[PDB]
């Protein structure tokens, strides 16, 4: 077309790979202020679910357990590889704004 | 307020329960525009704005945080200073049980309905953004032919930049009128950033038009690669979208080279708050400290604690500030005809002094003469002050802060004693004379009889009387005032004492009390500017 | 040049025309405003190669309570001063019987110079300035309040009124450019006249040491 | 007589009266006024400062050693 | 521990995970000192 | 050695006679109350 | 009631109170919701992806998928959501018509509801309170010190001091540094200044 | 040419009022004039004060241990206050006129600028147990 | 951990795609321990012969 270059070298596979582990759980992160997705990235790692499948065996120090974990019903496609459907933390809760 | 097709009460008058006693207030509300009180209806509220709470009901006007919240003069500010403290906290608590109660009647959310705009507002949007970006296209090119001549003091980079600067900010005004014009009544942002709880114009701004345009270390986005930006641009490229301009919104979401520069932007903020917290944990610490030592001895003298003297009366007058009040001194301004038209008294015209007075005064006064040549020299007296004014104020302003609130406090002197302005009354004109002479002796904050301390005495109690007597002028208060006689002793009785108890304590700590008062602004203010 | 220098020499004369008037000299009335074209004819047009010679610019002055007590002033003619050329001067105040006397330094003085005036401490009292500080009024600046000194039996009304001691009071070195434009020794007290804007009108006082 | 201080009883001086008049109460001193079915020392002690009937007297100390001597009867209370 | 909002703002608190330590006056003298001087009522306004 | 234990930040001094730790004191997290006063704050009962 | 709960942006918030089943508001067909958070924290900082995984997994438990969120998509408007939102029989936006839980009447606005996924911190309340009076003290310095009881005293630290010299108060200042920590009587001699 | 201490200076005549020339008119009206002004990159004010053509009543520096060279002790108070005022009030905040000459008036009150650091509060000469609480404490003790 | 200077601090251009731009610690630790992207790899290192 009328073109901003036309000497190409390189493509990007899909441009969500520029987020980290904890920062990509977070549905439509584009659509937030951006001070508030560095606050979560840094939240998601203390709450509350199970931590591994064989938490009977381990005798740890300080383990929490939630008893019925759920997975999310808005997921982003980048969490099938990192196993945040076979090990969730949360619930899926009914909230009203008033 | 209606008893015919059905029993309704209103809001006002409702409210009107809660506030205490018979206090007297004006305030305005945010959305009062400015070209309304010149005009015609400046006493009729067609939006219902500008709060009068009259012989403490409110009449008129919508309330909101200028009237209720955290400013110098509000509802609370002079429920607090008439009361006292047992009323206020009343005051305070029934206000938010009422209006709780009353709030799960109607109920308030925030949904995304309250998020978005009508296609005609979108579509004007679009347009003007794509006009802003097109300019800023023709501004680059005509740099490469070298058609622009640096401003004295400027480079050709820094002249280019401040241009772009401006058409950025004219863009992101012409989207805020588009958007804010387009807000409903229904809506719940502009119902949190009218009512002054939470919000603001930059948010709605932000959240449906245009994020903005992000910077780091007080410039746009600079080329952290080699003559880019991010590895996606072309090199030696100036244009808005390269550099940082988020066209977007909140609720279109952003794209990805778009969100990062976001992230960059967000991230420097979050730098500033934690080093800002260090700083302040140890300036304003160090501050405290140095001038603990400092108090009010039983002299009225601040003295150190090796008793040298760091200043001979406090504050420079003797007051404590937790009780005085913004007021003006409405001489200094005016020109010369109009302050001898306000203020002279002059007994000449002999119709205007019988339209505001009774008549058996005016022709007593007139005959007596002594009488004449009294307030001939208090009109000179007045003079001298206003000579003296207009030099301790060089400037022009006239907002000076002082004791007891004297307008409101001749506007309840109206309301106690039931005072009709639409008759002549009466006040004997020497009465107010000889009154403001004594109540001036009473008031003394330096104690002493000696030639040495009234002089002393006489440069403390100097601006305060200036504004008595300015306020006090016999001419202004038998003509706007009228007041009757017995409504003048409770007047004069009151301003003694207000005054005694604003007298500051001697003992309290005032070198702790001012660090920590130093302390906080230290604390507000930004870390680089 | 000499526009240059028969600009200065009126300035700095116009300024120490007003010091001597403010400590309380007796100065005629058009001495003060003495415009610079007057200045030019009276002493001479340039001091280039001309008359004024920063001689027969001296000034002699008698206090207005007292004809006998008088203060000279003196314009030395090298850059920076010896010894016995103050001592030229020292002579010519033993000759005249005046004890009050100043020297407009033009560019500096040496070490040397500095010990030999301090050693006359009981008589012939010189204050030593120079000609850069002497160009402006600091005095009629903006930030600086009304200064005014007081008499030794005002002092003892003080400490008297507010039961001070004189240790007490706020201090104030003799060094600095207000103390020595009043000629300002340790153990007098100034008072300081400034308005505010809560009261209006506050005096402060300060004691010099 | 030569008294240079306040008539009125600053806001230091009503706290600490208040207090030391309700402790001298609580060790079963002898109370000054008609009480009427009252047994907080400290509401007993807060009724008799607005009678102007609490037997303790100040004394105020100048900065230059000085001193003069008010009782509590001769002042002004503040509230 | 449970307070009255309209004291959120001079303690500059809120109310997602704050902790506030309370002190308990014992004698009788600085009771009478703390009601008589530094109660909640009585630090309506400001002097700074 | 007696300089060290006398020294600065947590010495003798500026830690055991200016700041001190002291007993009678308790801290819980806040909620909100909004059927309290002013003048007000609601203990739980295993802390009175 | 005093444990943290927090969403997916970032909106920590701890516990106030709980009510019943038949004190929440409801729906016209009885569905009451588990969580009721203010409306004044979206304004100020302004999470909107807040407010629409609210009303897209509100899609997806009526339809049964589970929906997508991949940031940069550009598939996924709001007018796609919402449009598949009114076939379902609901309003196009979320809002819904609920009735008071004490009085069963309606209320006059129409209150945002949807369902959301959130998290449960690890800070609880259990945790966090400890008091102390009059508990065991040290041995060589005689200042409190902490117990078995997990409870030792919380210090009154310089600008602590500072507080109370502003306010004037010169008795409580003194209990709390003196009385409350290590009291102590010793006996001087008078005519020399040392103990005896 | 020029003053070797001032390296590069500007010019312009202001919109508010503060920096314009405020005149009582003839009528007795408070008039505002626009006035174009040089305002420097570098100090040295006694040059500058004694330079024709430039107003000696109205200079002012930033530089307050440079107003304490050339003006005096009380220009500095004052001139401190004013700077004070000018920090605080920039981002439309009031903090009371008492504080600020309460601060203004002990850091000025011995004659010269005591700083508010450990350099000039620890030399004030107090007791001995109030300089051993601040850094000095067994030196302090043994020379008392 | 506590050195004020911004540069080593601030996000900079060049973590496009390596280090992830949103998740970072608050505090005293701002900027100074990050975490990288997903698909970013580190090299392990060979022999230029
Ligand atoms: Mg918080
Ligand atoms: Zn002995």
């Not at chain 1, 987020?19 to 203390?46: E, W």
């Not at chain 2, 090796?306 to 001979?312: A, D, P, R, T």
């Not at chain 8, 004060?49 to 109205?58: A, G, N, T, Y």
């Not at chain 9, 630790?29 to 580190?42: E, F, P, Q, T």
Request: glycine share 6%; aromatic share 8%.
């Amino acid at each position: 077309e009328v073109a901003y270059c036309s000497t190409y070298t390189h493509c990007e596979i899909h441009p969500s790979m520029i987020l980290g582990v904890c920062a990509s759980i977070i549905p439509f992160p584009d659509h937030n202020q951006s001070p508030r997705n560095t606050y979560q990235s840094a939240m998601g790692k203390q709450a509350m679910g199970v931590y591994i499948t064989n938490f009977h065996v381990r005798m740890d120090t300080l383990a929490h357990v939630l008893y019925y974990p759920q997975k999310p019903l808005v997921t982003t496609r980048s969490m099938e590889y990192l196993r945040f459907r076979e090990l969730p933390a949360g619930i899926n809760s009914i909230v009203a704004i008033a | 307020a209606i008893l015919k097709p059905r029993p309704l009460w209103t809001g006002k008058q409702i409210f009107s329960l809660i506030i205490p006693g018979h206090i007297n207030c004006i305030r305005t509300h945010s959305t009062h525009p400015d070209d309304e009180d010149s005009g015609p209806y400046k006493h009729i509220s067609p939006g219902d704005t500008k709060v009068v709470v009259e012989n403490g009901e409110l009449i008129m006007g919508i309330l909101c945080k200028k009237s209720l919240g955290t400013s110098a003069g509000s509802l609370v500010h002079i429920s607090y200073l008439e009361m006292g403290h047992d009323i206020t906290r009343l005051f305070y608590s029934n206000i938010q049980t009422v209006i709780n109660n009353w709030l799960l009647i109607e109920g308030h959310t925030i949904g995304i309905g309250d998020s978005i705009a009508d296609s005609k507002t979108y579509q004007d949007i679009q347009n003007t953004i794509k006009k802003a970006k097109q300019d800023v296209i023709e501004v680059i090119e005509k740099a490469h032919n070298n058609e622009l001549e640096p401003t004295p003091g400027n480079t050709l980079r820094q002249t280019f930049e401040n241009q772009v600067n401006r058409i950025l900010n004219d863009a992101r005004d012409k989207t805020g009128s588009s958007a804010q014009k387009s807000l409903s009544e229904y809506n719940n942002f502009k119902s949190m950033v009218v009512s002054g709880a939470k919000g603001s114009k930059i948010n709605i701004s932000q959240v449906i038009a245009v994020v903005g345009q992000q910077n780091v270390e007080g410039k746009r986005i600079p080329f952290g690669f080699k003559h880019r930006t991010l590895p996606h641009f072309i090199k030696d490229d100036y244009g808005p979208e390269s550099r940082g301009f988020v066209e977007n919104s909140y609720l279109a979401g952003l794209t990805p080279t778009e969100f990062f520069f976001h992230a960059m932007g967000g991230r420097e903020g979050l730098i500033d708050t934690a080093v800002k917290t260090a700083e302040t944990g140890y300036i304003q610490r160090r501050l405290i400290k140095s001038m603990e030592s400092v108090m009010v001895k039983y002299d009225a003298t601040v003295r150190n604690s090796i008793n040298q003297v760091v200043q001979l009366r406090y504050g420079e007058d003797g007051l404590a500030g937790e009780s005085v009040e913004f007021q003006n001194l409405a001489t200094l301004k005016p020109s010369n005809k109009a302050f001898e038209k306000k203020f002279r008294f002059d007994y000449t015209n002999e119709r205007a002094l019988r339209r505001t007075l009774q008549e058996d005064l005016v022709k007593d006064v007139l005959s007596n003469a002594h009488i004449q040549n009294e307030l001939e020299r208090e009109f000179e007296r007045m003079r001298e002050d206003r000579e003296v004014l207009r030099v301790i104020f060089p400037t022009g302003d006239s907002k000076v802060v002082l004791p007891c609130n004297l307008l409101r406090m001749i506007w309840n002197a109206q309301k106690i004693f039931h005072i009709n302005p639409r008759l002549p009354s009466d006040l004997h004109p020497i009465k107010v004379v000889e009154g403001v002479k004594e109540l001036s002796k009473k008031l003394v904050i330096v104690n002493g009889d000696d030639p040495l301390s009234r002089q002393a005495q006489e440069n403390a109690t100097l601006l305060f009387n200036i504004h008595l007597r300015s306020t006090l002028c016999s001419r202004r208060m038998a003509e706007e005032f009228r007041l009757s006689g017995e409504a003048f002793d409770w007047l004069l009785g009151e301003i003694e004492s207000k005054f005694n108890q604003a007298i500051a304590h001697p003992g309290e700590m005032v070198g702790a009390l001012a660090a920590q008062s130093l302390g906080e602004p230290a604390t507000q203010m930004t870390l680089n500017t | 040049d000499d526009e240059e220098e028969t600009y200065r020499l009126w300035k700095i004369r116009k300024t120490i025309m007003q010091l001597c008037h403010d400590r309380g000299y007796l100065v005629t009335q058009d001495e003060l405003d003495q415009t610079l074209e007057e200045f030019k004819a009276q002493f001479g047009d340039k001091p280039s190669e001309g008359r004024p010679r920063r001689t027969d610019l001296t000034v002699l002055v008698a206090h207005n309570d007292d004809p006998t007590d008088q203060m000279f002033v003196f314009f030395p003619e090298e850059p920076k001063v010896g010894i016995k050329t103050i001592k030229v001067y020292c002579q010519r105040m033993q000759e005249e019987n005046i004890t009050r006397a100043l020297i407009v330094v033009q560019q500096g003085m040496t070490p040397s110079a500095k010990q030999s005036l301090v050693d006359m401490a009981p008589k012939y009292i010189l204050e030593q300035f120079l000609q850069q500080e002497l160009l402006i009024n600091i005095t009629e600046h903006e930030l600086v309040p009304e200064h005014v000194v007081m008499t030794k039996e005002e002092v003892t009304e003080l400490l008297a009124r507010y039961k001070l001691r004189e240790n007490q009071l706020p201090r104030i070195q003799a060094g600095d450019p207000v103390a020595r434009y009043f000629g300002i020794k340790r153990g007098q007290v100034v008072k300081i006249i400034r308005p505010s804007e809560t009261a209006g009108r506050y005096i402060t006082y300060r004691l010099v040491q | 007589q030569k008294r240079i201080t306040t008539p009125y009883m600053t806001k230091y001086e009503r706290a600490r009266v208040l207090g030391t008049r309700a402790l001298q109460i609580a060790m079963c001193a002898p109370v000054m006024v008609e009480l009427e079915g009252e047994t907080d020392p400290l509401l007993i002690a807060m009724k008799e400062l607005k009678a102007r009937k609490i037997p303790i007297i100040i004394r105020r100390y100048l900065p230059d050693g000085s001193y003069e001597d008010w009782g509590v009867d001769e002042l002004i209370i503040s509230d | 521990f449970r307070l009255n909002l309209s004291v959120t703002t001079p303690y500059n608190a809120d109310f997602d995970g704050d902790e506030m330590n309370l002190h308990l006056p014992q004698s009788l003298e600085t009771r009478a000192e703390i009601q008589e001087l530094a109660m909640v009522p009585r630090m309506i306004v400001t002097p700074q | 050695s007696l300089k060290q234990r006398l020294k600065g930040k947590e010495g003798r001094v500026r830690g055991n006679l200016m700041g001190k730790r002291v007993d009678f004191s308790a801290r819980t997290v806040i909620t909100p109350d909004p059927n309290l006063s002013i003048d007000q704050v609601g203990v739980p009962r295993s802390i009175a | 009631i005093g444990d943290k709960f927090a969403s997916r942006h970032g909106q920590k918030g701890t516990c106030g109170i709980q009510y019943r089943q038949e004190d929440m508001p409801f729906t016209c067909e009885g569905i009451t919701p588990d969580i009721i958070i203010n409306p004044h924290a979206i304004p100020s900082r302004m999470t909107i992806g807040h407010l629409i995984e609210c009303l897209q997994g509100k899609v997806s438990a009526n339809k049964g998928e589970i929906g997508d969120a991949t940031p940069f998509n550009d598939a996924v408007n709001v007018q796609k959501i919402s449009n598949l939102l009114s076939d379902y029989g609901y309003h196009l936006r979320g809002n819904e018509v609920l009735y008071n839980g004490f009085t069963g009447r309606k209320i006059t606005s129409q209150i945002f509801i949807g369902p959301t996924y959130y998290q449960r911190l690890k800070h609880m309340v259990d945790d966090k309170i400890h008091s102390r009076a009059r508990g065991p003290i040290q041995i060589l310095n005689r200042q409190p010190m902490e117990g078995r009881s997990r409870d030792g005293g919380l210090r009154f630290g310089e600008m602590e001091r500072d507080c109370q010299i502003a306010h004037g108060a010169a008795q409580f200042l003194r209990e709390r540094l003196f009385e409350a920590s290590d009291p102590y009587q010793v006996h001087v001699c008078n005519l020399c200044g040392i103990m005896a | 040419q020029g003053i070797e201490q001032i390296s590069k200076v500007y010019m312009h005549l202001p919109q508010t009022d503060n920096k314009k020339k405020i005149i009582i008119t003839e009528d007795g009206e408070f008039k505002a004039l626009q006035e174009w002004i040089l305002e420097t990159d570098g100090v040295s004010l006694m040059r500058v004060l004694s330079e024709k053509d430039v107003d000696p009543v109205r200079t002012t520096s930033n530089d307050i241990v440079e107003i304490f060279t050339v003006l005096g002790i009380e220009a500095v108070r004052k001139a401190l206050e004013r700077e004070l005022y000018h920090v605080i009030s920039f981002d439309g905040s009031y903090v009371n006129y008492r504080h600020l000459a309460l601060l203004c008036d002990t850091m000025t009150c011995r004659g010269h600028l005591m700083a508010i650091t450990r350099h000039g509060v620890n030399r004030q000469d107090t007791g001995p147990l109030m300089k051993c609480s601040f850094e000095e404490t067994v030196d302090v003790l043994m020379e008392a | 951990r506590d050195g004020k200077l911004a540069k080593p601090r601030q996000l900079h251009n060049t973590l496009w795609g390596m280090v992830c731009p949103a998740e970072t610690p608050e505090g005293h630790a701002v900027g100074l321990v990050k975490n990288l992207a997903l698909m970013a790899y580190i090299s392990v290192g060979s022999q230029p012969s």
